[PDB]
Amino acid sequence: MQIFVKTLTGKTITLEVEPSDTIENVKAKIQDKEGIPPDQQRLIFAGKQLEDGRTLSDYNIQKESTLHLVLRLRGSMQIFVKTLTGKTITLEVEPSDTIENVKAKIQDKEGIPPDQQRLIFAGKQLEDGRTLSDYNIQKESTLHLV
Amino acid sequence: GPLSVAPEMDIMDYCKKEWRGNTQKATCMKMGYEEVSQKFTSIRRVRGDNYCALRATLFQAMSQAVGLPPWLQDPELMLLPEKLISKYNWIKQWKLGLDLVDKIKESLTLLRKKWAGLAEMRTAEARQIACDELFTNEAEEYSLYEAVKFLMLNRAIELYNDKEKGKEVPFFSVLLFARDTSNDPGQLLRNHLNQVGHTGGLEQVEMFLLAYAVRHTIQVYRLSKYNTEEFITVYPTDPPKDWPVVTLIAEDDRHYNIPVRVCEET
């Protein structure tokens, strides 16, 4: 069975799915088609937000029926990456974003290798797996790099 | 002081400054900008303080203010903050960044006044000159966001009620209130609106809400989405004939900045 996942720009993603599939599955599916990490994802059907564990059959969802994707991701966070050169790197972020993801942006933005990036906050080195949220980084917190 | 809306910077020099790693992703950022830079000469760095969404939009809408839109011109708007508070008391659960009804009324009154100042302008140079000195400032600006957020909440109520009455509403609102943490206007407020300018920004579904609140269509270049349907994302998707339009840019859905038109230039 095909189903459709709609975004809030009306963009339609087609998936091949089975009744016995989970939402964890579908979110994971949507990650290839579209890159979106599952944590960001909500799926809505019949005005209900679907639970990861329960199956498509459970939600009485059918061939050619349409789910809606409503992401948790938000607008307006910025933070600062002070450097050895003096250079301040200003990063567009989401509290959700992992240190792992940051190292990665940082490489994106001005070309330094994460296996070499020593990210600090208030003197604490930074679990690539942990996130900004858990580290209690307010909008406009300033960080150091080594 | 990290200014609200930085002066116009050549966009081509910008993507060059900011996208200087060797990464695959960076390329997509560069290409994103290249497209934009055909319509737009320059870019204005909006401050990334969790208000970026409202600041960007409202800066735009107001800088280009041609006439004062009627919704603002209506003076029942003044009496609306008292009304909502009377009816829905949980609105006292309101969480400021910078008694309570008076404060909001004052905030909204400010918005009406300031926006009319820019409409009654003669030149558009004058109009915009004027508008940067709004956002230069500290306290006045942040009041405007308490007004807008209010207007968002008003509208959220308005719509939720209509949905429940069986009445025809915008589909985004259906999904707005489908969220576990945003089932009803109360829930939205406690969990989403209050945290704006504190913990977090607007979700995309709430961009929708924003446009509705101020009756301006928001149109966004999302670089992340370059070479796809969504690259120029529009809130709302099927905007009204009349509603004026603001253009914003979002590298990766996490902050909003302002692309400057060729003719709108300083």
Residue numbers in the entry:
A (entry chain B): 1 to 146
B (entry chain A): 78 to 175, 183 to 350
Publication text:
In turn, LUBAC activity needs to be tightly controlled and the deubiquitinases (DUBs) CYLD and OTULIN cleave M1-linked polyUb with high specificity and efficiency (Keusekotten et al., 2013, Komander et al., 2009b, Rivkin et al., 2013).
By replacing Gly76 in distal ubiquitin (Ub) by dehydroalanine we designed the diubiquitin (diUb) activity-based probe UbG76Dha-Ub (OTULIN activity-based probe [ABP]) that couples to the catalytic site of OTULIN and thereby captures OTULIN in its active conformation. We incubated bio-UbG76Dha-Ub with the catalytic domain of OTULIN (OTULINcat, residues 80–352), which is sufficient for specific binding and cleavage of M1-linked Ub chains by OTULIN (Keusekotten et al., 2013). The probe labeled only active OTULIN, because C129A substitution in the catalytic center completely abolished covalent attachment of the probe. To verify that the ABP is able to capture OTULIN through its catalytic cysteine, we crystallized the OTULIN-bio-UbG76Dha-Ub complex. The structure was determined from crystals grown in similar conditions as the earlier reported OTULIN C129A-M1diUb complex (Keusekotten et al., 2013) and belonged to the same space group with near identical cell dimensions and low root-mean-square deviation (0.51 Å for OTULIN catalytic domain and 0.55 Å for diUb). Although the resolution of the OTULIN-bio-UbG76Dha-Ub complex was lower than the non-covalent OTULIN C129A-M1diUb structure (3.0 versus 1.9 Å, respectively), the electron density in the well-ordered active site enabled complete building of the thioether bond formed by the reaction between the Dha and C129 of OTULIN. The mutation of G76A in the distal Ub moiety severely reduced the affinity to OTULIN and completely abrogated cleavage of diUb by OTULIN (Keusekotten et al., 2013). Indeed, there is very little space in the active site, and the alanine side chain at position Gly76 potentially clashes with catalytic Cys129 of OTULIN.
